[PDB]
Design a protein around this ligand. Structure first.
Ligand SMILES: C[C@@H]1CN(CC(=O)N2CC(C)(C)c3ncc([C@@H](O)c4ccc(F)cc4)cc32)[C@@H](CN2[C@H](C)COC[C@H]2C)CN1
Ligand SMILES: C[C@@H]1CN(CC(=O)N2CC(C)(C)c3ncc([C@@H](O)c4ccc(F)cc4)cc32)[C@@H](CN2[C@H](C)COC[C@H]2C)CN1
Ligand SMILES: [Zn+2]
Ligand SMILES: [Zn+2]
Lengths: 106, 103
């Protein structure tokens, strides 16, 4: 249940962009499948459910406003694919953003 | 806010002092030590053995005697910046490899 924060991926079968792209197939949900594959995610085949090949972290119910890489950071901040690809400079923006997002509206 | 804080500012700054966090436990006779939990940034909710990190907001429960506060902090809230400040990524990584080698 806990997410992988090691530097080795949990599903190395899904480590190649093409392997991940194939899992979606015809994809009808609001959020783009190339965008999701680039962000590490492959598809389960149960609705819009996706999983990061590295952290194992899963997400669902994608709104059009929700960005793969942004959601990757929100829920799986320990991911090492995330850190390798966007780098803690970016990752900290999201979190301040996402915390500050909540203080305004309340 | 279900998602955990990975900013460098704590979520509950009222619980940022050790003496604050420890005062929440009171008489505590769950299996795992309350000073150990407070040092690891946890304070008590008062609903069983439920605790919360003052920084990440990350919550845990049902403490086995085998389960260590700092180890569980890393397992479930690896993005915590109190965790990173206090143990460093050197520690944090071995403890992940140790969990991920079990799983
Ligand atoms: C794109 C966003 C993602 N949000 C978060 C989300 O999807 N999370 C959060 C979290 C990490 C607690 C979580 N754990 C499990 C699932 C589960 O379904 C799943 C299991 C295995 C998989 F391989 C894929 C998915 C999902 C999931 C959405 C908000 N979420 C959802 C509606 C789930 O319920 C909580 C609520 C706050 C909005 N859209
Ligand atoms: C000491 C360990 C902790 N484990 C993990 C655990 O406590 N987690 C995992 C996680 C992060 C998904 C999670 N999210 C919510 C709670 C919730 O209760 C809570 C909310 C707010 C609080 F302020 C305090 C607690 C807890 C919790 C235990 C294993 N856990 C538990 C039994 C919870 O259910 C899942 C299962 C795998 C073993 N003991
Ligand atoms: Zn990941
Ligand atoms: Zn924490």
């Amino acid at each position: 249940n806990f997410p992988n924060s090691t530097n080795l991926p949990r599903n190395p079968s899904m480590a190649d962009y093409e392997a991940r792209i194939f899992t979606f197939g015809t994809w009808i949900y609001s959020v783009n499948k190339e965008q999701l594959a680039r962000a590490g995610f492959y598809a389960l085949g149960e609705g819009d459910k996706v999983k990061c090949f590295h952290c194992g972290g899963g997400l669902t119910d994608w709104k059009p406003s929700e960005d793969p890489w942004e959601q990757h950071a929100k829920w799986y901040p320990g991911c090492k694919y995330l850190l390798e690809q966007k780098g803690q400079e970016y990752i900290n923006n999201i979190h301040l953003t996402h915390s500050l997002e909540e203080c305004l509206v309340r």
